Structure formats: structure tokens, C-alpha cells
Chains A and B, each alone.
Chain A
């Protein structure tokens, strides 16, 4: 998961 990554920011958004």
C-alpha cells in the first residue's frame, strides 16, 4: 500500500 502507498500514500494517496
Chain B
């Protein structure tokens, strides 16, 4: 499969999450995603075929994971935006007020602004701290997906949101949305990963 940020993959033939970013760890290919999406050694599939397994994760506390891929996978420096693509150029962290977009398999590509950093989400499993909040909308299934600026700077991966009864927070004004993502930089340094860029 071609590994592009934002696309669907399943975990052990049951949950769905979205690909965050293509990365490498030495000769190993992988992608970063959300920790709550799978446990270590869970099987990741893209379009019915096995692409790799969860190599490491931390959830709750943090919400991060990376999946090591078989070498048949093609890592691409891109994030899906409809039929188009946003090229990944690096991971400079944007400040509050900066505009940002996110990509995932439920709601597609959505944009908004970073509204706060170092937010704690209190999920049923336990607290996840240190998250950044934006007001781009998102829905169940978008977890693990790319948050990136239009300029191509990778910000992080989707963690959670104030989901409404329709499965997303796209039907409430931006002012009322809390969509939270896990910062990319601590994930890259914790697993010694390098981002694929173009």
C-alpha cells in the first residue's frame, strides 16, 4: 500500500484509525498514529492486506504509537486532502493562533486554528496530558490522523474531541469545538524516528 497521512487502516480486523505520518527508524519503515488505536503487536491492515504491526505505544498518559511496516510498503511524504495531497516538509511546531488542518478517514480534511496547548483530556481510560487543542472538526475514526499546516509542517496526530451524538463535532460552531492532538516532536524523539519529507 502507499502510506499517505489521513487514510484508513484497521487494527486486528476491528477498530479503524487513520495514518498520521510516514517515518523511518533506520532501515525500518513505519507510520506514527495514536496510542489508543492498538496495543503492541496488534495487526494493521490497509484495504484488507496486512501492512505491519504496532511496535510501541503509550496510552493513556500520552496518546502515541508507531506501526512498523513490511518493506513492501511505499512511504510517501504526503497527507491526503480529497484527491489532492499536502507535502510534508518538516515538523516546526506552530504557535497558538496558527491555522492548521487535519486529515482522517471519517471527516476528511478539515482546517481551523490552534486555540490552546497543554490541555488534559480526561478519557475513561485515564488522563492524557500535554495535548494541543484546535477547532478544526473531526469525528470517530479520525484518531491517529495528521494535523499539518498548509505550509507542510507536521504538528501531530489526532487524539480525541468533544464528540456530539452524530459521531463528530462538525455540526457545532468552531468556537465550541475541542479537537485535541498529540504533538509530533516528542513521538519522533521517543522512538528515534525520522519523518519522511518531500
Contact indicator B34/A1 (Cβ below 8 Å): no
Bound CA–CA A1/B123 (angstroms)? 7
B44: CB under 8 A from chain A? no
User: CA–CA, A3 to B122, complex, Å?
Assistant: 10
Q: Shortest Cβ distance from B178 into chain A, in angstroms?
A: 6
With the chains together, A2 CA to B167 CA distance in Å?
A: 11
> Which of B46-54, B76-84, B86-94, B158-166 lies on the face that meets chain A?
B158-166
Residues of A within 8 A of B178 (CB): 1
Q: Which residue of A lies closest to B169 (CB)?
A: A1
Cross-chain contact A1 with B180 (CB below 8 angstroms): yes
What is the bound-complex CA distance between A3 and B125, given in angstroms?
10
Interface residues of B in 110-128 (CB under 8 A from A): 121-125
Chain B positions within 8 Å of A, measured between CB atoms, are: 34, 36, 63, 121-125, 143, 159-163, 178, 180
Could you name 23 residue pairs across A and B whose Cβ atoms are closer than 8 Å? A1-B121, A1-B122, A1-B123, A1-B160, A1-B161, A1-B162, A1-B163, A1-B178, A1-B180, A2-B123, A2-B124, A2-B160, A2-B161, A2-B162, A2-B163, A3-B34, A3-B36, A3-B63, A3-B123, A3-B125, A3-B143, A3-B159, A3-B160
